[PDB]
Amino acid sequence: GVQVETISPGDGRTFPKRGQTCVVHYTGMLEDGKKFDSSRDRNKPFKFMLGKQEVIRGWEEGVAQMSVGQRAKLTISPDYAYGATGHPGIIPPHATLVFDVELLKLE
Amino acid sequence: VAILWHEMWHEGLEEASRLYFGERNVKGMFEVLEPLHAMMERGPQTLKETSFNQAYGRDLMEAQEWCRKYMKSGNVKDLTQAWDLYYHVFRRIS
Numbered sequence A: 001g002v003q004v005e006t007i008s009p010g011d012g013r014t015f016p017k018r019g020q021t022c023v024v025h026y027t028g029m030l031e032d033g034k035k036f037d038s039s040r041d042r043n044k045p046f047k048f049m050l051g052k053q054e055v056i057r058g059w060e061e062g063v064a065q066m067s068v069g070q071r072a073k074l075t076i077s078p079d080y081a082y083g084a085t086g087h088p089g090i091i092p093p094h095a096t097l098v099f100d101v102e103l104l105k106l107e
Numbered sequence B: 001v002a003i004l005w006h007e008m009w010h011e012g013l014e015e016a017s018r019l020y021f022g023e024r025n026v027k028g029m030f031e032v033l034e035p036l037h038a039m040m041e042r043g044p045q046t047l048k049e050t051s052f053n054q055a056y057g058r059d060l061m062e063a064q065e066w067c068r069k070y071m072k073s074g075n076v077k078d079l080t081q082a083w084d085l086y087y088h089v090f091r092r093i094s
């Protein structure tokens, strides 16, 4: 599935609802720590609407159980991410992904 | 048919990103995008096409260039640079 490990706690009550827009900062890396993408390198947050299949399942289920302010470590199985095909040239086949993602606010 | 450039690029980009990101279809991605870039090439004929062009014209032309570079290089990195610009214009059109 996806494992969620807390780095810094959120307020414990403000969670995202389906259809809400989640504003996050993320740094993504392969399980060996090789970074492939980071919103912090760009200084601008990432937005996506929850429960719309805009993002991979691991993000949908992982971020859903985070509360505002919380910085967590998402360990995502290839099943909840890019699968056997992966993403050609970027993410290899059958890759477990690790995202450092902080839920900044809900809109 | 008659279509606003605002609307044409919105649905066009949604389609292209579905095909590339969702279905791994880069050939199909080129199919939907090329017509929209061709329309821009003949140039604005209304006030609404003129204002759209003034706002988003440079970004779209630059994105087409990164697609063009991908074509020669094989560097998937060049396609992502195109989509960075496409995402940018999309989220302003919305």
Ligand SMILES: CCO[C@H]1C[C@@H]2CC[C@@H](C)[C@@](O)(O2)C(=O)C(=O)N2CCCC[C@H]2C(=O)O[C@H]([C@H](C)C[C@@H]2CC[C@@H](O)[C@H](OC)C2)CC(=O)[C@H](C)/C=C(\C)[C@@H](O)[C@@H](OC)C(=O)[C@H](C)C[C@H](C)/C=C/C=C/C=C/1C
Pocket: A026, A028, A036, A037, A046, A053, A054, A055, A056, A057, A059, A087, A090, A091, B013, B014, B015, B017, B018, B021, B022, B023, B080, B081, B083, B084, B086, B087, B090
């Ligand atoms: C600069 C290049 O940057 C890319 C993102 C890169 C690509 C490669 C990835 C290593 C990565 O580096 O992200 C990455 O770190 C990462 O894996 N992410 C991005 C951050 C959120 C988690 C995950 C992800 O789900 O990406 C996903 C993943 C790649 C594809 C998803 C996966 C779930 C599927 O359900 C869906 O099927 C279609 C496609 C990409 C996105 O988050 C973007 C925003 C969203 C989409 C493309 C689709 O939802 C699309 O649907 C038609 C839309 O509705 C969008 C809004 C329409 C507009 C026009 C498209 C804009 C394109 C934006 C593209 C970018 C910013």
